[PDB]
Amino acid sequence: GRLIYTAGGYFRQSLSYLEAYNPSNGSWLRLADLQVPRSGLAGCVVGGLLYAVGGRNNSPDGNTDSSALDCYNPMTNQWSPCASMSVPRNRIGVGVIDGHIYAVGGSHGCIHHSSVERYEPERDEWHLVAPMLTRRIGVGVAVLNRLLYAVGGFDGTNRLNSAECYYPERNEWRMITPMNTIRSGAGVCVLHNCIYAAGGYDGQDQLNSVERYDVETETWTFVAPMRHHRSALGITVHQGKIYVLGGYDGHTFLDSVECYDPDSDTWSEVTRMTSGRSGVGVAVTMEP
Ligand SMILES: Cc1cc(C)c(C)c(S(=O)(=O)Nc2cccc(-n3ncc(C(=O)O)c3C3CC3)c2)c1C
Known part of the structure; x- marks a missing residue:
């Protein structure tokens, strides 16, 4: 599309912001809350519409995990509710295959989900599919070649370096090669034939390292690290480059946005969010 949308997030409390960054001119727009x-939500796009999935409202009033699915139409600058998921899912991951939204893992209080469910926009319906082999919150999710990958996270006891792949026509999950780093709350995305995992928390430190999985070789390789360590970052791809947004570096809720050029294997700072925050949902679609 043309703009990078960032929805929600956390700073002192959960946030309602929807802001859109335009890489063509450096500008940020504040859109409908x-x-x-x-x-701890995730963002995705189907048919030009932006969806916000799951998360949690941490507020002074109290703290409520979200099962919600909401749809933002850039033409109208309006949010509409959709059908809710079977369960609340904070610290969720999502991926889109063939116009359907897969909601993966996440937490409902102390429940750490392995369950996975699929949304069909044409019917406004959710249905459960086969659960993952592992409970995962803070799970990175990506889609490559119409297969769904769940990467890292936290299973209730340990942060994970494991990853697994969902084969839709078999309704089956299988482990893939584990990452070389334990990562929970990483940013995961796809670029060319690889699944990238950037940042996260390894149980001790927020990470700046970045590694990618080549589905043909089934191996993970480190690339250039980000300039800033970050967990609970937003991540997306725009014209062949990876953008990482915000997160927490152990000291500050970051406003930094970095951009990865895979041809030069370099990261550069490209803009700052209007305020530091973590746990955002991010996706790319047409300008409003
Ligand atoms: C109060 C508070 C404080 C801080 C520092 C943050 C970041 C958030 S937050 O909104 O950004 N929460 C969030 C979003 C996405 C993923 C995760 N997440 N999932 C698993 C783990 C882990 O520690 O294993 C994490 C952590 C490593 C990122 C967590 C909140 C509410």
Whole structure:
């Protein structure tokens, strides 16, 4: 599309912001607030519409995990509710295959989900599919060649370096090669034939390292590290480059946005968000 949308997040409390960054001119636009504040959500796009999935409203009033699915139409600058998921899912990951939204893992209080469910926009319906082999919150999710990958996270006891792949026509999950780093709350995305995992928390430190999985070789390789360590970052791809947005570096809720050029294997700072925050949802679609 043309703009990078960032929805929600956390700073002092869960946020309702929807802001759109335009890489062509450096500008940020503030758009219609989410109806309910949420951090730990995920964003995705189907048919030009932006969806916000799951998360949690951490507020002074209290703290409520979200099962919600909401749809933002850039033409109208309006959010509409969709059908809710079977369960609340904070610290969720999502991926889109063939116009359907897969919601993966996440938490409902102390419940760490392995369950996975699929949304069909044409019917406004969710249905459960086979669960993952592992409970995963803070799970990175990406789609490559119409297969769904769940990467890292936290299973209730340990942060994970494991990853697995969902084969839709078999409704089956299988482990893939584990990452070389334990990562929970990483940013995961796809670029060319690789799944990238950037940042996260390894149980001790927020990470700046970045590694990628080549589906043909089934191996993970480190690339250039980000300039800033970060967990609970937003991540997306725009014209062949990876953008990482915000996160937490152990000291500060970051406003930094970095951009990875895979041809030069370099990261550069490209803009700052209007305020530091973590736990955002991010996706790319047409300008409003
Ligand atoms: C109060 C508070 C404080 C801080 C520092 C943050 C970041 C958030 S937050 O909204 O950004 N929360 C969030 C979003 C996405 C993923 C994760 N997440 N999932 C698993 C783990 C882990 O520690 O294993 C994490 C952590 C490593 C990132 C967590 C909140 C509410």
